[PDB]
Subunit: 347 residues, 5 copies
Amino acid sequence: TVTYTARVANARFGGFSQLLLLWRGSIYKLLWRELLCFLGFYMALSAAYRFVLTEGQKRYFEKLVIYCDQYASLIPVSFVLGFYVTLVVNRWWSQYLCMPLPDALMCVVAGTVHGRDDRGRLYRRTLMRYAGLSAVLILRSVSTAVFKRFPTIDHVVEAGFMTREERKKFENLNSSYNKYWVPCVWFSNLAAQARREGRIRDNSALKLLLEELNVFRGKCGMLFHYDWISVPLVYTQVVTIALYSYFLACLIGRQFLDPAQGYKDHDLDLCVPIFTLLQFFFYAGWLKVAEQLINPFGEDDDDFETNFLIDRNFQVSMLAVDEMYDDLAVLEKDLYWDAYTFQGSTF
Amino acid sequence: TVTYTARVANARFGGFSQLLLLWRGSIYKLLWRELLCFLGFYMALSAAYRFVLTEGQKRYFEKLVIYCDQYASLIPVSFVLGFYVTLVVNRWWSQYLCMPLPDALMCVVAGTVHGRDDRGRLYRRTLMRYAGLSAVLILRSVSTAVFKRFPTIDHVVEAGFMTREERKKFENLNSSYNKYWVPCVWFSNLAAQARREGRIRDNSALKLLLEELNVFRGKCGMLFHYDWISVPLVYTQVVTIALYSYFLACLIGRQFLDPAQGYKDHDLDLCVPIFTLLQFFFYAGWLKVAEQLINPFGEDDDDFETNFLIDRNFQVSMLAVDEMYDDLAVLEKDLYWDAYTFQGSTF
Amino acid sequence: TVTYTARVANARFGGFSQLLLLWRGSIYKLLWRELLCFLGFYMALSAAYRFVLTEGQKRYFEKLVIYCDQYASLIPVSFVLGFYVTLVVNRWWSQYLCMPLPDALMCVVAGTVHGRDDRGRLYRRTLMRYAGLSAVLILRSVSTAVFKRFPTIDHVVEAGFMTREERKKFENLNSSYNKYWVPCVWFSNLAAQARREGRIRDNSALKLLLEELNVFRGKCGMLFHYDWISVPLVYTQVVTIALYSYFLACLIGRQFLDPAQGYKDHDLDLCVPIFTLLQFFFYAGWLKVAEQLINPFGEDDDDFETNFLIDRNFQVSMLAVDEMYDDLAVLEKDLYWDAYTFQGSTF
Amino acid sequence: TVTYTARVANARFGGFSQLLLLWRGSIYKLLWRELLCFLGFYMALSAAYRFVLTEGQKRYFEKLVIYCDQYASLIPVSFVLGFYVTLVVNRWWSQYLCMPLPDALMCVVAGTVHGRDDRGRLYRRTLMRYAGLSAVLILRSVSTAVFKRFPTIDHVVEAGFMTREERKKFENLNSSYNKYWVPCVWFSNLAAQARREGRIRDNSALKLLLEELNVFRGKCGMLFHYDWISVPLVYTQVVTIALYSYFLACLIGRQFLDPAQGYKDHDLDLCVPIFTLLQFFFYAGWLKVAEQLINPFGEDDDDFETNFLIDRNFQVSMLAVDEMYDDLAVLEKDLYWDAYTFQGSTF
Amino acid sequence: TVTYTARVANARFGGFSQLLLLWRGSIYKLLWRELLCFLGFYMALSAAYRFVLTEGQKRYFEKLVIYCDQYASLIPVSFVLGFYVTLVVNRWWSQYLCMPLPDALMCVVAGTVHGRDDRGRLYRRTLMRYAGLSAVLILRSVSTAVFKRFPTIDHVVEAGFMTREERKKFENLNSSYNKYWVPCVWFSNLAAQARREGRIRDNSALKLLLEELNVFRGKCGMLFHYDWISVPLVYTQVVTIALYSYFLACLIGRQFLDPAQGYKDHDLDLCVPIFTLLQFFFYAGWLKVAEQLINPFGEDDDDFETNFLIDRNFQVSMLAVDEMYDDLAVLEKDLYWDAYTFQGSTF
Ligand SMILES: [Ca+2]
Ligand SMILES: [Ca+2]
Ligand SMILES: [Ca+2]
Ligand SMILES: [Ca+2]
Ligand SMILES: [Ca+2]
């Protein structure tokens, strides 16, 4: 994730110009290889046309260039690319909203799971750790960065997310399917045990805990669903072929022809297809942004900071339910007890 | 479902190029017959024009080719196809989200339906099986793959989803309408019996069970609604006719005319309508993706793995509420009891 | 509603071709009169131009035809029609989702309203009948088919949805506004009476009943709101005028001119405006689909089966809360008590 | 609001033609002045060109007309207008859904706030009146029609929505911000008093009342938010300037030039720019529909019937919670106690 | 925020014309510098072409102008800008809906946290202040205006949102991540203390408080998420480059060429590219509106009134839960105890 929200807080004269000088998370970083390859093939064709081909071969090549320039428009590149990129961007923001956060659960656990003794601390810390462990299991399932951090369950145990007893129980469970849900069932069992023990003082508090756990588990499941149900491979194939075929057609049809031949709209030889290069930049860049966003759990610059989120979620959850439990400042009268650096349209 | 999420985790130089070599779930698999038929009709017309027709018939055919090339644009193929495909894709993802999953219910049942004895196991297993049975009944109603797996209720009974006593009760119910809802009413009755028996310890836990059951039943009902209320047949007819009429017009108007006649934009005979074939590829491919996605419960490669989901849901539900009930590891102090391989914009 | 979900489960070679032979719910059924009228006016103009007008009148008519062909593009038909049809289709699916279904309520009532005696049966049947009666009142308010079935409240009483005592109470209520909500208030009162009587065993069950009743009543209200707040009449007028004006312009500008006059793009007289007819087919068909979908509660083929839904909802509700109450098969150990015909991306 | 849902229930031969004869809520009513002004300026320019200007001034004017006709396309009128109108229409339907309705609250109050005595009637009537008063305060804040009906709080007191004691409390509250929320806080306090008094029999019923009150208050707040956060003024300015500049360009570039000069596409003088007038009709009409819908709380024909809704909501709420409380017909066996004028795809 | 809802309540003859005279929140204010710079570069190029370049250099410049005019269309400016602006506007309204409001919480607190004594006042005021403090912490994290108002936590303490004891607890918490959530955990702890003390009278009221707190905290978290996950920098770079490259191309290709050279569509020298300036106005204005809306928490005229909202929320919350607690007017019979200045389609 490359944040630039601060840089664009106010609409200024050089508003988006200053963002063109960024390299991390940039279009240039994602596209310089493809742009160089396109320019290389174009210059190879241009050198062949200018120096290698005979006069008759040049006339045939010019006829082919005009044909491919005219009929390259029949490729619905804008049509297919717009649809695909809209679908990918919607999925991208939806997938970010699907990452499970323990904030709701840590508020509820701090409010509902009671006891200053070691057992109360154990209950609160274990509930938040089960939530974190479910998040880690699904994230290492769906995120290449989290997988590289946790390539085995041994790594997850060594990171403190899973104990060795919990590891024995987890691997002893006979299932061929993804086990990210297992800590959520542990959470439900532990919440029921805590309520039966009296650590949870009422049935409504237990109901709230289970509702927030189900929201968290739904988010983990939704991450699994987005990972499994890819954007239909046929859409990806079609848009990739559309871009490739259109730009091979442009490699042919955007060549500068000899202005001595008096071909219409062919009288200025600039030797470098500046607009064709800009059109490639924009269209191939759009597809590269979809390429980068299609799996936002990879290791691209604008991919989600999944490992940062794991560390932040674990630290904040443990702070919220252990350090901060029943740790209020004494109720003190505020500044305005005895009270800087629009009403409506029809009034 | 053909997953390729891993292959596109990072935006790489050969980003989407390597996905063009896939055959399962590909555009080539869905479109090679239609592409061959279009090319066959085009080559039949081309052979007739080149070898069969007389000179006067050739001049008339060339006038007709230019007319059909000019006025084939009056068919709003892009207009109708874009609308249709957007509607189908929205319905497709909505329909995937509508498939009932027992994860919420199995978390709640593991947390709320109590007893290590045989009767507690029976209650939890039976509640999850009623949920699974409702899912199976609606899925065999809406999915051709699940129907082929369960062509009779006898098959469902033999698969263990329905008992023989439950089969007698189910067929003895006098209703001409789809009975997928019957196990949900069984679930409500059984949850009430469990609460009255004391297996469910509080009224709030029963309320949570009934709320999650209603979410599950709503998902089953929504699957029935999507199966019943098709994309309006008039849209499907209109887009099919648009594609067919446009490409028959192109079969006429994209023919290569004799360059000796000096027709404008007709001076290069390539004998194979490469761009017209690419345009057919993209437009007919878009319609074929809508064709494949319009009923995502068929047996296409990118159709949902409904039978896999049935097996996974049943196995995971039975694991969650029977093997995993009250089966926590002893509460153990974690690694950070005494504590790898952004703050904001305005700071 | 014309369902064809089964016919398109798999993407086949003749995928959407076989749906072009359907007549019920077809574009041909909605559009053959308009297509015939357009063709009749076109042939009247063509016959006048070919046989009636003098040479000077023919030259003036040809100038007018070229003018109207050129400047008919200034009508934003695609612009206005796309916006309108998207709005109508969104409203159409939203309106289908707004039809009240008693499935949630019948699950809750079967789970919560207790007693095998006649009084328990009366309570459950009466609650589901109040829900059904609210649905019938709003549906006869908004649906022409349901109104034809229930043109008076006498018809509703004779159908068993309302008793005669309830009819006296209903007509004795002094209100000039639609009374579809009245049975929902009866439902709330009856649920409170049932809870006070002990038929509902707990306050949380009563709360769940009232929440599901409010969901049902919200759906009835939303149906009233969609019926009242039409698609803005100005949009309907604008799109109707756009289609009509554009196709009158085409009636003028698509005429085949005498090829002897050597007008550019006028040298092939086909005597039948095949593409213009296809363009009319697609554009007028799009507007006709919006026409049919704009009120999905009429008697069009693809309009909702409101009377079928009323009968199904009543029968299934009465089955669920009367026949099926506390009527479980004895808890029996399933087949897998002692256990046919993907893990993640990063693994 | 101009309802025409009934007129379009069935897709008929003269489907949308009969709606073109409506004047109330019509495009003609909103656009006849602008259309007359555009036609007046066009005819002034036409008369100047035909009668006033000299030959050289005519040649210069013809060059300018051709220039402005060619380059008027550079104005993205379709681009900006489509975006703006989609945003306005989405906000319009969202704003209609945001109008608070007391139906949920009146169902809950009839079910939960008990007592046939005068005090129970007072509690139910006062709770529904607080809801109605919050609706009236925000509506007179946001709606010009409701403001004209209630230009002072004295008017609201005289209408029975606020008592004089409540008026003293309301004006004695020291706040510079909109006080529409005040009756909602009164509602919360009164609901707590009713529960403490035993009129509300359980804590879950009080929780349901407060949840429905918060839904109602959220709707009032959302109306305030939509009134405050206008569609960004820069969008409105940009689209207004786009329409105005484009049609001034058309006032220049759509002039009929002397056909004797042999200008291409200028050989038929119709003296009335029929298509240009139709294009103005459609584009300016689209902007006028956005103009009318942008504040749907004004006094346009298709603006919401806010005063009708206030009267209906008050009357129906008072009927529901006072006349209809505990006023059921005796539980009577229905017609089908001893039982007119699709199963699935894969079956 | 520049509200103009009142000015457009009714669709009037001069409907949007009168909004073109506004300067605050206007397109002119955001765009006059860019428009002046574009016009300056254009006039520099025009002066060079008219006075400086030789005849041969003029002929080459004219060839380049025609080339750049023809092929500037290959830049998908409309394509990329439409996508970007739609994404930004959706995020903009979503971000406005994500600003936490204490209205739900103040209704619940006034209804549920009891006691007229000093301790009850302290509990209610402290709960609302914790909510306000969470809002302030996240807003100074995400909003430049709120940061300028609260550049240190010392400023927040001096404003009365945080006490000094709470400041000691807040800074003593060991966390490297944003601490906006801390007051929400304080809220959960304080609500639990209030329920345990008997100030909250029932467990369902505590559950409602925690649910509304979690809604509030979710809104604060969502503000953090929108601030962190910017619109992908690659989209911003691509659209900025598209606008810049297209308008540099227009700086070249929109130059008025010497009409003596008889270049087609170059025969009228207006010396000022009025349409090109209008096209720049619209396209650059669209991008400037996205620039202004992309971070709606800056100090632009149409940016959200975050400091006004902070002051309003604090004042209204303190009014609602302190002044207005248990402060009803005596239950009085309303005006219509003994009862001005549509039924349905199918009736
Ligand atoms: Ca990625
Ligand atoms: Ca399929
Ligand atoms: Ca209809
Ligand atoms: Ca209005
Ligand atoms: Ca800003």
